[PDB]
């Protein structure tokens, strides 16, 4: 009967849809801190570039639909500040009036996602210093682009948001610099594959500063410079994209177990250790198919999967989450960057004995016009030969190959079994042996 | 030590390479009727269109390479006319001098592939009436185009070659007509998916004549008209594109078992019923993963796989062929046409209880620019839900989806298991749920 969901996006609303469809007697209350439900965070960098007309295009399902069509009591501007899991009561503040509302539950779902991290640097609050998470976040970047003379842009963090936004700011015709604490950008990539990223950014005149630590943002009313341990550089707009943190702060005091980064531990059924409390999405842990422990790889695909499952499991339609593979894909200028399963640092960290194969080949028949380079790397166990991970980088046909590799990892295939799959071939799409199959043959 | 291989292309030479690499003592004789080894039949339609410079670009490995680098005794213009399996002797006739040569073997592989069928119509032999199989075939088609004023082109048979060449002739700026014996072109496609094919052809002004039967080709020294049961049409060049027959004729009188089509029956290890005789490629049968029966789906991916395997098995490096899935992919004008596993006709013929799901979707996030329609159909067992087959049609992202479906079929996945795979998502590549997963959700 009484279902409460905290967070009105991918994981939360996937759960809501499941409950609503499979229980007519259910009273669904969803509590969202912001004013916007079910939107596509993935489209943000492409709204900022101007490729998409507006942020309005990123709304998947508006609140009126949730209320009128599905009978969900979708609350906006309700921030949850406390949960009493014993009395089964959720306490929410109104973000404007600051008045306090309570919501009784039979089953609770926490789907509060993650927020971007802003390190405690001087000048972090200066105008023109931006994090990117939400539609308003994007609009505030658009405001800085609209109302100011922006020519130099500095990005802190050479990960997923930093890479895509480097494209966006290049496309908007800015002089882009990226500052990365670690040894290379695309840190989820092995050293040898990361080289391809550095070449592409270099080619488009993106200054990459590696092993460099930001100390302060300098400026008056606005940012005008970024100070590091190695120098001070003019900046008209600073994007901070240095990772994220689970929105699980408000749970301190509930006995709900979290891992070291604050992600809520869930079992196969999206259940926490506390009775009738569930979690899903970026705020939760993600059982890893290959690592065989609970990881934290916050991503939209996983969030919808976990959200859907949490909903079903809350209805007692028992269904286990099979896990993440750590898949990820990024468009970066002319390159597509794809990975899945284990990279070399993950395999090493786990003390799993592995070997690698790397093939430089083409996306399609070498004789065909506009066949393009494809760089493909695979990891596999030394003993059993079980496929462990893949990294694919190139201009075209990269998403295809990572999806096939993901399929192989999901099914725990040996690397040599790939040789046997009847994958498709015609000249405009592949070679008579797919690059994955050629790599598999090179394997021991 | 004495290995004899009949056929110098994909299946035959894949076998040759395995033997050569894994037995330094071996005497390999390969017997090829034509003059060209290891070439890409797949690139022929794209040579004729002018997209590829010449047929030279289609040679993967030279006979000179085979002889000098690998020490294979590669024979050209050697047509095998009979085999004595008791004496272990192969009889080859030189195609020019007509001289007969004997070759004794310890182990024999037959890799003679298939040949295009020319029905016994009047006018068969008129200049400008062409089959397409070989590089000389391609050259003859170009010879007609160079020396003859070609305006109207008529293609007989609306299968794989008819489809690709219909594009090739359109691109060369010709008026193209297609005449098909049964109800629709792309007969391997279900009626409902085939609609998309005749919409694309129509769009490009390709006349499709269905349930219509060629009666004769009319003309002087050269072809000038095609005659059917329904009319007579101007044609300056006729491509006959009506299917293929195994080149196994010369084995009559041996006890080597063939299926009804004349394809040579092989066990897991590419062995025929006759001691020390092996077969591989288009001339042999193809165990079907889903049908669980020996099929005949002649294709180059399978040919190379079977060839490689025959070579290994001939060396007593025992390895079973896992089967075909009947995967096929075609570029047709602006469409990519892909299928794998069972269609409805195949499932019905086998009396496997099945159901279907069809999704009209996009290749990538619906809000992203130039996201294109994607039409996707899946068949699955009504009882176990085992995935049985897929058909995918659209302008982009089709090869990706069919490869993923192929992976699912190879691993005998249930249709709903697809929902659980961590497939890649970013906006330029996919939607947060892949079309395959959305189809899977609709399934019972
Ligand atoms: C720029 C960008 C690009 C991305 N691109 C991709 C991509 O290409 N592919 C991909 O798979 N993923 C991508 N992602 C990630 C993906 O968008 C997220 O993984 C997904 O949104 C997670 O869903 P969720 O429901 O767990 O969390 P969110 O979507 O973050 O939803 C959590 C919601 O909970 C609310 N909330 C938080 N705390 C409270 C509280 N105390 N009380 C009430 N409500 C609260 C928040 O307001 C928020 O709306 C991208 C993210 C960004 C920022
Ligand atoms: C136009 C066209 C496009 C194609 N496109 C694709 C595609 O996109 N993707 C794909 O996977 N496949 C494609 N194929 C099919 C693919 O090329 C074949 O399946 C593959 O070549 C089969 O290899 P094979 O070694 O079994 O037979 P073949 O390649 O046909 O080789 C057999 C050889 O044996 C020789 N031979 C025959 N009889 C004798 C004899 N009596 N004595 C001595 N030698 C003999 C022949 O001369 C021939 O060279 C295409 C085919 C054509 C015609
Ligand atoms: C060209 C042809 C002889 C290829 O033979 P092949 O054995 O598949 O390929 P190669 O001879 O190049 O060797 C591949 C082997 O070398 C190894 N290898 C290749 N490159 C390597 C490298 N750079 N470093 C180390 N090893 C390598 C691979 O691991 C593979 O080993 P395996 O055969 O034990 O699995 C054969 O495909 C053919 O005749 N084709 C006709 C053209 C065709 O394919 N037509 C059909 C089109 S539809
Ligand atoms: C929009 C959102 C609510 C979608 O919820 P959803 O349940 O996945 O999708 P729908 O509500 O459309 O329902 C789909 C269900 O209806 C069924 N269905 C869909 N179309 C159908 C049709 N035409 N006929 C019959 N059944 C249909 C499906 O089989 C599916 O069934 P299941 O839920 O039992 O598997 C959710 O994804 C969301 O809020 N997302 C936020 C945006 C986002 O995804 N962000 C992250 C991007 S990185
Ligand atoms: N298409 C995609 O997969 C995609 C795209 C964009 C965003 N996202 C989502 O957003 C989340 C967060 O993105 P993100 O880029 O903020 O995190 P991230 O983990 O992708 O990138 C963080 C980067 O910042 C670096 N860093 C940390 N501290 C730093 C410092 N002090 N100075 C300089 N660099 C520092 C890290 O080394 C790392 O390279 C991802 O986990 C993902 O869920 C996904
Ligand atoms: N990309 C690819 O997969 C691809 C492309 C080209 C060729 N090929 C290979 O070539 C082989 C044969 O190609 P194909 O196109 O010759 O055969 P096919 O089976 O693909 O097409 C034959 C077509 O001819 C029709 N037909 C038969 N008799 C007819 C008649 N009397 N009048 C009119 N139509 C008639 C059939 O109904 C069928 O539609 C395929 O099996 C495949 O191995 C594959």
From TrEMBL, chains A, B:
Keyword Oxidoreductase attached: yes
Residue numbers binding NAD(+): 160-161, 164, 180-182, 243, 298, 329
The entry's keywords: FAD, Flavoprotein, Nucleotide-binding, Oxidoreductase, Redox-active center
Binding positions for FAD per the UniProt entry: 10-11, 32-33, 41, 80, 282, 300-301, 425
Pfam families: Pyr_redox_2, Pyr_redox_dim
Protein name: Pyridine nucleotide-disulfide oxidoreductase, class I
Positions of the Pyridine nucleotide-disulphide oxidoreductase dimerisation domain: 330-430
Family, similarity comment: Belongs to the class-III pyridine nucleotide-disulfide oxidoreductase family.
InterPro entries: FAD-bd_OxRdtase, FAD/NAD-bd_sf, FAD/NAD-binding_dom, FAD/NAD-linked_Rdtase_dimer_sf, Pyr_nucl-diS_OxRdtase_dimer
GO molecular function: nucleotide binding; oxidoreductase activity
Species in which this protein is naturally found: Bacillus anthracis (anthrax bacterium)
Record-listed CoA binding positions: 18, 21, 38-39, 42, 61, 304, 308, 441
Source organism superkingdom: Bacteria
FAD/NAD(P)-binding domain ranges (all copies): 2-294
Keyword Signal: no
Binding sites annotated in the UniProt record for NADPH: 160-161, 164, 180-182, 187, 243, 298, 329
Required co-factors: FAD
SUPFAM superfamilies recorded: FAD/NAD(P)-binding domain, FAD/NAD-linked reductases, dimerisation (C-terminal) domain
């Amino acid at each position: 009967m009484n279902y409460v969901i905290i967070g009105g996006d991918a994981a939360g609303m996937s759960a809501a849809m499941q409950i609503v469809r499979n229980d007519e007697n259910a009273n669904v209350v969803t509590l969202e801190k912001g004013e916007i439900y079910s939107y596509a965070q993935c489209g943000l960098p492409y709204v900022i570039s101007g490729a998409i007309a507006s942020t309005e295009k990123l709304i998947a399902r508006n609140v009126k639909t949730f209320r009128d069509k599905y009978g969900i009591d979708a609350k906006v501007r309700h921030e949850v500040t406390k949960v009493d899991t014993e009395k089964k009561i959720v306490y929410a503040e109104h973000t404007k009036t600051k008045d306090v509302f309570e919501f009784s539950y039979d089953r609770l779902l926490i789907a509060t996602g993650v927020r971007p991290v802003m390190p405690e640097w001087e000048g972090r609050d200066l105008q023109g210093v931006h994090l990117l998470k939400t539609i308003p976040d994007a609009e505030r970047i658009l405001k800085t682009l609209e109302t100011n003379k922006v020519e130099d842009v500095t990005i802190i963090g050479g990960g997923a948001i930093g890479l895509e936004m480097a494209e966006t700011f290049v496309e908007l015709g800015k002089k882009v610099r990226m500052i990365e604490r670690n040894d290379h950008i695309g840190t989820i990539y092995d050293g040898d594959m990361a080289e391809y990223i550095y070449k592409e950014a270099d080619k488009h005149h993106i200054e990459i500063l590696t092993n460099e630590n930001v100390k302060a943002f300098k400026g008056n009313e606005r940012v005008e410079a970024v100070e590091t341990d190695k120098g001070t550089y003019k900046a008209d707009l600073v994007l901070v994209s240095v990772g994220v943190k689970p929105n699980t702060d408000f749970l301190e005091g509930t006995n709900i177990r979290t891992n070291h980064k604050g992600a809520i531990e869930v079992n196969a059924y999206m259940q926490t250790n506390v009775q009738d409390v569930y979690a899903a999405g970026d705020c939760a842990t993600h059982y890893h198919v290959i690592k065989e422990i609970h990881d934290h790889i916050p991503i939209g695909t996983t969030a919808n999967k976990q959200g859907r499952l949490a909903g079903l499991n809350m209805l007692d339609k028992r269904r286990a989450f099979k896990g993440t593979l750590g898949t990820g894909i990024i468009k970066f200028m002319n390159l597509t960057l794809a990975r899945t399963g284990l990279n070399e640092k993950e395999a090493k960290g786990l003390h799993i004995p592995y070997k690698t194969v790397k093939v430089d080949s083409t996306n399609m028949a070498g004789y065909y016009p506009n066949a393009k380079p494809l760089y493909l790397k695979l990891l596999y166990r030394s003993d059993t030969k079980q496929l462990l991970g893949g990294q694919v980088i190139g201009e075209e046909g990269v998403d295809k190959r990572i999806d096939v590799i993901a399929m192989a990892l999901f099914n725990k295939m040996s690397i040599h079994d790939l040789e046997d799959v009847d994958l498709s071939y015609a000249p405009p799409y592949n070679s008579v042996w797919d690059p994955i199959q050629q790599a598999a043959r090179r394997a021991e």
